[PDB]
């Protein structure tokens, strides 16, 4: 008979400090998404560059703002 003793020290992360998330939706019909947790708005930029590399001349995109301003749906026009 083995008893318990607190959950094994979680060696992954306590829900992390704040998980941010970006999204790469396109007008052609190929929508996509992305996510980079860690600090807070420090990921907001890493995200703006995330969709920046996807600038295949589609006309750029508009940064959305939901979830308190952490989620940003980057929609490319084109």
Q: Are 20 and 47 in contact (CB under 8 A)?
A: yes
> Which residues does a chain break follow in the chain (C to N more than 2.5 Å)?
none
Of 36, 29, 34, 35, the C-alpha closest to 76 is 29
Residue that has been written with the tokens 């995109």 in this structure: 61
* Cα–Cα separations (whole angstroms), residue 1 to 4, 7, 28: 10, 18, 60
Annotated binding residues for Zn(2+), written as ranges, equal 16-17, 35, 41, 64
Tell me how many degrees the CA angle 52-74-27 measures, rounded to the nearest 5: 100
Annotated binding residues, written as ranges, equal 16-17, 35, 41, 64
Domain 1-78 has CATH 3.10.20.10: yes
Q: How was this structure determined?
A: NMR
Domain boundaries, the chain: 1-78
């Amino acid at each position: 008979e083995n008893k318990e003793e607190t959950p094994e020290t979680p060696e992954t992360d306590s829900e992390e400090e704040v998980t941010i998330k970006a999204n790469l939706i396109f007008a052609n019909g190929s929508t996509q998404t992305a996510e980079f947790k860690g600090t807070f708005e420090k990921a907001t930029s890493e995200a703006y560059a995330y969709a920046d590399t996807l600038k295949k001349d589609n006309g750029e995109y508009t940064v959305d703002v939901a979830d308190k301003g952490y989620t940003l749906n980057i929609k490319f026009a084109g």
